[model samples]
Target chain A: YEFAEKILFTEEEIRTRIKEVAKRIADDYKGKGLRPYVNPLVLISVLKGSFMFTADLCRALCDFNVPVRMEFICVSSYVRMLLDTRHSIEGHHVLIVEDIVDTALTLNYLYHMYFTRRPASLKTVVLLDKREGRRVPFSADYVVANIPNAFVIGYGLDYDDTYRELRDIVVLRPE
Target chain B: YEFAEKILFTEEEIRTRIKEVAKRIADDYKGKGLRPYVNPLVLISVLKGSFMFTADLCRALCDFNVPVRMEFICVSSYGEGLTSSGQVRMLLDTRHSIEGHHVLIVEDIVDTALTLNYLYHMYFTRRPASLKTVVLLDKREGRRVPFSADYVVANIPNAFVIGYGLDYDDTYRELRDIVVLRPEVY
Candidate 1:
């Protein structure tokens, strides 16, 4: 419970922000002047950290009656490896969902990787964007909240595999 | 729907089997004589085909109060030229290292067990504390590799089936019931 002491974002706040983000995405895709590519919009969730976020966002999109195709990709920086199950994204508008954006290194790599696939368009959605610590020239198209440069856990984020089940985001006290 | 007319296994049957499988797993791992190594046993789902099965099975495990850490790995047999060359390519792997965790592989179907065999060896190399395989359907006639799932929900004949996360050309995956596909449908 020590980790829950410093709540960065409460459960209600996170839910409201996510609903707004979901609404924006739905409106943008469903509005006119945007070339229609496919029936269901593809939402790719970067795994481990974004699982819970992806699950909630997908359900929200469903509530809005937004047609969507859910996919997940897991990348590891420890071995400089990327694993994607999607065979082809050709001519499809792809939305990459992430839990947090810190250095933007991994997102940059993913952007380049997906760019090569020749999708109709690519956009990124991040729940937390730490704009202060950017080592790469990348940004999320849809950001729900901005957080300070502190260790955080909860809502699919974790510290050594702890506190992920926590509903609200919280800052981890320094050791 | 035109594609779902030939239903092989109804939704009820699949659900019943899954519950049984979950109970068996819970008993094996959480029952007597089980050496307590760690908390939250690792459950890895091979993706694209097993997404729905994994989701449902995980929910069932939860209903049973089984502590499981879910993970996913996506592998494809299609290599260069987009042809099946008997080569397996890893598209996604588990983020958490399973070095000392009891791992369970949840799959939608086991046909030939070629990819399952390859994955078994790959995870074996990682030296997981223990490894086991589970599948919703087992096609024993199509076994090209000498591997079998430790737990199987149902034995199916060698027929192309789709639904409940299994897809044919990416269609029929939304169907809840498992159905056999006509040869000319594809």
Candidate 2:
């Protein structure tokens, strides 16, 4: 409570960029989209972290009339997690939703795991890209923000489980 | 899309009711709430049905600065053919322990109240600081077990309702208003 904070992204900026990303995704899938029998795109979100991002992204894609289904993986660690979906993503287009790529361990692990699932196509969208902090040589298909290794909180990122409800992204600074 | 539908609650009505319910929640939790140190409410939502409801409700509650975290449990229910008991089986449970946190279960509709009560008992033993439920629609005549939520938007009769996150044959979920299917459709 006794520190300064820098606004990384306003709520409006995040919303606008999400909509733009949605448009890009829709454009990419418009022609190469599935046939009537093929399953729609499945958005797999890692929970507690990507809930707000997933919600907003799903709503944004709906603006483009892109058919999407959401699934969750309640992962506390990148080791093993439960997959929550009624149907398999084997033949469907899959979009991996990630909040921030800090060490890229989470992103790399998810990428490798879902790649083995044999989805028709797999892509990743990360809200923040901490390129300098990547311990693994991996990159998301879509990166919203290129950030430093600073303490960020808001819009699905949190510090001590608080400040997640804040709509804007802020970087916490110590005195 | 072969079925004719009847509108039950317009999008306006649903929005207004939700805002009002948010106001009521804020009022109830104002000073009588969990004291200064304890955490705010965690909105535990069962998935596929309550996702949209939880999203809206949490956003509404934020109007009063009610800090809430959302957790989800995915479950699928069935009747006659898919299963005999016609019950819901949890697929993905909540990730958090939530042992001492104040919690509120969010649901889109309460029909039969079986799953709702069943979940209440399930979460009851966990010894949360407080527990409550908020639901959007209540089918008064459809309950097989006795249960009522602490907060409900509307009470409806037995109708094949769908829309605003409720679906029939996995359709009509994106519709703006809550609507009922014609008897012939079922």
Candidate 3:
């Protein structure tokens, strides 16, 4: 039922934030002589999670006159971020758009591995950032909000596989 | 290397003999109902040639008290019907998940018995509840190996058998019954 105790962002906040991320990305790559028909293949979200955010972000970019293709990298790194590269991340431009970056351990490790694959480029875009020390060298290229290190859920994010279907981000309380 | 070739049982002879083999199998477990403990769990079929005959024989045993599970094993020997390559590879092995169940090996024919002998040991290592073989044709006792079939049909001559699901160079298998190869083609 009511698993989350704190509401971090209302539904409107997430939408406005994602639009900001899209605008900045569009501005950064505006008329920079990118590869012809360079499809912006974002490798995240599949089978579950991130579908809503990815679809909205892609539509936002299209309105900015950037026709980009999206691809997904189905990985099992949700449990342990710093453990291992779940699978080979070879030669592909990857923008890991995650709902939240808590410890940054797993995300930092993933960034390094993505570097090895020689993606045309690599960057991280997160909706919620818990400003903490990194286990490895990395930082999110785009962050919509800095949240206190609390277990939050909803807005395509979840706590223990619950609240992923929620439209707004909420925080959880201790028992 | 050319091995010895001798006349064994004719095509008509082997067909008639298969009926007797089937009768013995049907009688062995006739009244027993097809239960898990009594039902057959795995049938290893030697592939690329034994395809047709194995299907027929297994169907004949369908009326038996136990259910039948089937699998296929592929191997290539050295001489025509003589020595084995000494190494038997399983192109397709039993995928029946046989933790502890009965298994039956089905083959078109057994000549040198070298390949089948190796397979016997291989399947045995898997530890089935019970393991046995039922071949459509058997060569001669002198030409066999240390191993023997639990159930076999005709002890045919060592001539070239190329029909009823046997082949030479992947040809002539479409024929209805086994036939001797003409010397002009050899």
Q: Pick the candidate with the highest lDDT.
A: 2
Model 1 per-residue lDDT tens digits across residues B40-123: 767788876676676567657755666567787877676555533245877667877988778898888898787788788889
* Model 2 C-alpha lDDT per residue in residues A1-175, reported as the tens digit of each score: 2232878898899989998998999899998664322566688887767777876777677667676676777655636777555668898899999888878887788889889989899999988888888788887888778888888887778776665666778888521
Residue B171 lDDT, candidate 1, scale 0-100: 53
| TM values, all candidates | 0.66, 0.85, 0.44
lDDT against true structure, model 3: 0.59
Q: Give DockQ for candidates 1 onward, in order.
A: 0.14, 0.29, 0.01
Roughly what TM-score does model 3 have, to 2 decimal places? Answer: 0.44
True contacts kept of each: 0.08, 0.14, 0.00
Question: Best candidate, TM-score-wise?
Answer: 2
Which lDDT tens digits does candidate 2 get at residues B29-54? 77746432257677788776676666
Using alpha carbons, what is the TM-score of model 2? 0.85
Better model by lDDT, 1 or 3?
1
- In model 3, residue pairs whose N, Cα or C atoms come closer than 3 Å (at least 3 residues apart or on different chains), thus clashing, are A6-A171, A81-A106, A82-A106, B7-B157, B8-B156, B8-B157, B9-B156, B9-B157, B34-B65
Selected candidate, larger lDDT, 1 vs 2: 2
List the pairs of residues colliding in candidate 1: A83-B91, A84-B91
Give the runs in model 3 whose Cα sits over 4 Å from its true position. A1-175, B1-16, B30-38, B76-85, B141-144
Candidate 3, position A75, lDDT: 38
